[PDB]
Design a protein around this motif. Structure first.
Motif, PDB file in Angstrom:
ATOM      1  N   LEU A 136       5.282   6.728   1.105  1.00 21.79           N
ATOM      2  CA  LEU A 136       5.949   5.621   1.773  1.00 21.79           C
ATOM      3  C   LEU A 136       5.168   4.334   1.563  1.00 21.79           C
ATOM      4  O   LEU A 136       3.933   4.328   1.590  1.00 21.79           O
ATOM      5  N   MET A 137       5.901   3.248   1.361  1.00 16.67           N
ATOM      6  CA  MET A 137       5.299   1.952   1.132  1.00 16.67           C
ATOM      7  C   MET A 137       5.117   1.223   2.456  1.00 16.67           C
ATOM      8  O   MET A 137       5.934   1.352   3.369  1.00 16.67           O
ATOM      9  N   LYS A 145       0.869  -1.166   0.000  1.00 15.12           N
ATOM     10  CA  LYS A 145       0.000   0.000   0.000  1.00 15.12           C
ATOM     11  C   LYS A 145       0.909   1.219   0.000  1.00 15.12           C
ATOM     12  O   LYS A 145       2.063   1.131   0.420  1.00 15.12           O
ATOM     13  N   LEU A 146       0.400   2.351  -0.473  1.00 16.31           N
ATOM     14  CA  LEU A 146       1.192   3.566  -0.615  1.00 16.31           C
ATOM     15  C   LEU A 146       0.543   4.672   0.202  1.00 16.31           C
ATOM     16  O   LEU A 146      -0.651   4.944   0.046  1.00 16.31           O
ATOM     17  N   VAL A 147       1.327   5.303   1.069  1.00 20.18           N
ATOM     18  CA  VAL A 147       0.805   6.338   1.953  1.00 20.18           C
ATOM     19  C   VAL A 147       1.484   7.672   1.634  1.00 20.18           C
ATOM     20  O   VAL A 147       2.708   7.721   1.583  1.00 20.18           O
ATOM     21  N   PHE A 148       0.718   8.746   1.417  1.00 17.51           N
ATOM     22  CA  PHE A 148       1.340  10.018   1.047  1.00 17.51           C
ATOM     23  C   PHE A 148       1.334  11.082   2.184  1.00 17.51           C
ATOM     24  O   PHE A 148       0.363  11.207   2.960  1.00 17.51           O
ATOM     25  N   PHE A 149       2.418  11.850   2.259  1.00 10.54           N
ATOM     26  CA  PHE A 149       2.521  12.943   3.222  1.00 10.54           C
ATOM     27  C   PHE A 149       3.008  14.218   2.549  1.00 10.54           C
ATOM     28  O   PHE A 149       3.833  14.172   1.638  1.00 10.54           O
TER      29      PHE A 149
END
Ligand SMILES: [Cl-]
Ligand SMILES: [Cl-]
Ligand SMILES: [Cl-]
Ligand SMILES: [Cl-]
Ligand SMILES: [Cl-]
Ligand SMILES: [Cl-]
Ligand SMILES: [Cl-]
Ligand SMILES: [Cl-]
Ligand SMILES: [Cl-]
Ligand SMILES: [Cl-]
Ligand SMILES: [Cl-]
Ligand SMILES: [Cl-]
Ligand SMILES: [Cl-]
Ligand SMILES: [Cl-]
Ligand SMILES: [Cl-]
Ligand SMILES: [Cl-]
Ligand SMILES: [Cl-]
Ligand SMILES: [Cl-]
Ligand SMILES: [Cl-]
Ligand SMILES: [Cl-]
Ligand SMILES: [Cl-]
Ligand SMILES: [Cl-]
Ligand SMILES: [Cl-]
Ligand SMILES: [Cl-]
Lengths: 16, 16, 16, 16, 16, 16, 16, 16, 16, 16, 16, 16, 16, 16, 16, 16, 16, 16, 16, 16, 16, 16, 16, 16
Positions: P14-15, P2-6
């Motif tokens: 971040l993976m 899954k890919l998380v964005f900041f």
């Protein structure tokens, strides 16, 4: 911010 | 669909 | 009560 | 902001 | 623990 | 009903 | 218990 | 990988 | 704000 | 408490 | 109404 | 703690 | 069936 | 990885 | 099966 | 993964 | 109120 | 801040 | 709709 | 790994 | 029952 | 889509 | 058993 | 949309 609504009448929305 | 509210201004309602 | 929102158009806000 | 509560005693309410 | 509030009166805070 | 708190200052709790 | 982290400064880790 | 935290004391951070 | 940790090595924590 | 299992080796069961 | 249960001992069942 | 009920007989209430 | 685990000590695995 | 158990008898645990 | 309770008076529990 | 964005400016994903 | 349905035959719906 | 994504077309990324 | 991101390479955004 | 499914038509099963 | 899929190769689906 | 039922009278089924 | 509802039109109620 | 699988026979995949 997220917006949350309440029914009190009057409807009021509070920010999160 | 579920409706999700945000406040940025302006209100934005996004759906699910 | 808290207002929960759906969209089907008509927007529906139901009270919890 | 919304207040989120924990208990550890001390009660802590943190703001979202 | 998370603290969850209810209103019945009197307030009751219960935990997780 | 459940109790939700907000910090606006003044803290206000709304019932659900 | 699950550990939940917050940043306020200082870090606060609260548990479930 | 994301780090998920528990406390049992020992603090354990496991990678997702 | 909530704190989210990742292992990339180096561990980095990002605020929410 | 809820019991959550992980595999790393060795099994680790952590609780809520 | 639905009954939600906590334990703190006293068992508490609250109505939704 | 939250109390979760199961039926197997006999009732078993387990906690969080 | 899926096995759901609690700990109260006794470990209990219930089937879903 | 997380560990998920099933009762099929024989109990089998699968990694996530 | 999980057990769900309702207050209708009379309390009735339904299996899931 | 899954890919998380900041949003930090610069956006970083971040993976998981 | 929310409506929850059960199959017991007869189908019964309970309010929340 | 964390970026939460919706699609309505326009893609919207809102910051938490 | 909510947008969920994955990384496999290539990014894939899937919706709810 | 667990398979998570979406539909966009193409069916996509991604591995966790 | 719900159906859960795993990739082990061979794909296997387990009932819940 | 998931179907969510409410009772107000009249029944209203809203979707996700 | 609890009835879970979807809509795809046909309405489908599945038993848990 | 998320795809949810059930087994009744026959498999039924329903969406969100
Ligand atoms: Cl109220
Ligand atoms: Cl229309
Ligand atoms: Cl709610
Ligand atoms: Cl705010
Ligand atoms: Cl103390
Ligand atoms: Cl919150
Ligand atoms: Cl990774
Ligand atoms: Cl110790
Ligand atoms: Cl996670
Ligand atoms: Cl009621
Ligand atoms: Cl006691
Ligand atoms: Cl509830
Ligand atoms: Cl089964
Ligand atoms: Cl003991
Ligand atoms: Cl489950
Ligand atoms: Cl931030
Ligand atoms: Cl368009
Ligand atoms: Cl978030
Ligand atoms: Cl794996
Ligand atoms: Cl198509
Ligand atoms: Cl998953
Ligand atoms: Cl049953
Ligand atoms: Cl049709
Ligand atoms: Cl259910």
């Amino acid at each position: 911010a997220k917006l949350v609504f309440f029914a009190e009448a009057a409807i009021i929305g509070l920010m999160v």
